[PDB]
């Protein structure tokens, strides 16, 4: 996925966040304590015109 | 300083919180309090 700095707010005892369906949303690095949203890599479908 | 304290108990019961926009807790309901709560 792509690592984008987490604009949303955390709590002092909150290491990582999740939205739904096990899809972890945000994580804080275990060394410097910086918060980041993690978005799954952009993907789509491909169709043809013949 | 005269003090007052209260003692309550925790049970293994399912609670429905609403995680709000703040990453916080602002209200929740208990799935075993009353018949209506089971619906929620």
């Amino acid at each position: 996925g792509v690592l984008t700095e987490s604009n949303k707010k955390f709590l002092p005892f909150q290491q990582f966040g999740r939205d739904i369906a096990d899809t972890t949303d945000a994580v804080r690095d275990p060394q410097t304590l910086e918060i980041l949203d993690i978005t799954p890599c952009s993907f789509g479908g491909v169709s043809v015109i013949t | 300083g005269a003090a007052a304290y209260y003692v309550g108990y925790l049970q293994p019961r399912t609670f429905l919180l609403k995680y709000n926009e703040n990453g916080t807790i602002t209200d929740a309901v208990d799935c075993a309090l009353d018949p209506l709560s089971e619906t929620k």
């Binding site: 949303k8 955390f10 709590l11 005892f13 909150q14 290491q15 990582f16 966040g17 999740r18 939205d19 739904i20 949303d25 945000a26 | 209260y6 309550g8 925790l10 399912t14 609670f15 429905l16 919180l17 609403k18 995680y19 709000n20 926009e21 703040n22 990453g23 807790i25 929740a28 799935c31």
Partner: peptide, 24 residues
């Protein structure tokens, strides 16, 4: 003694940050 505990007793049962979502 007896008193009615209205709404307290609620906390974060875990260490995961979940936002803007109902969760039971």
């Amino acid at each position: 003694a007896y008193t009615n505990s209205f709404t307290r007793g609620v906390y974060y049962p875990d260490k995961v940050f979940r936002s803007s979502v109902l969760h039971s």
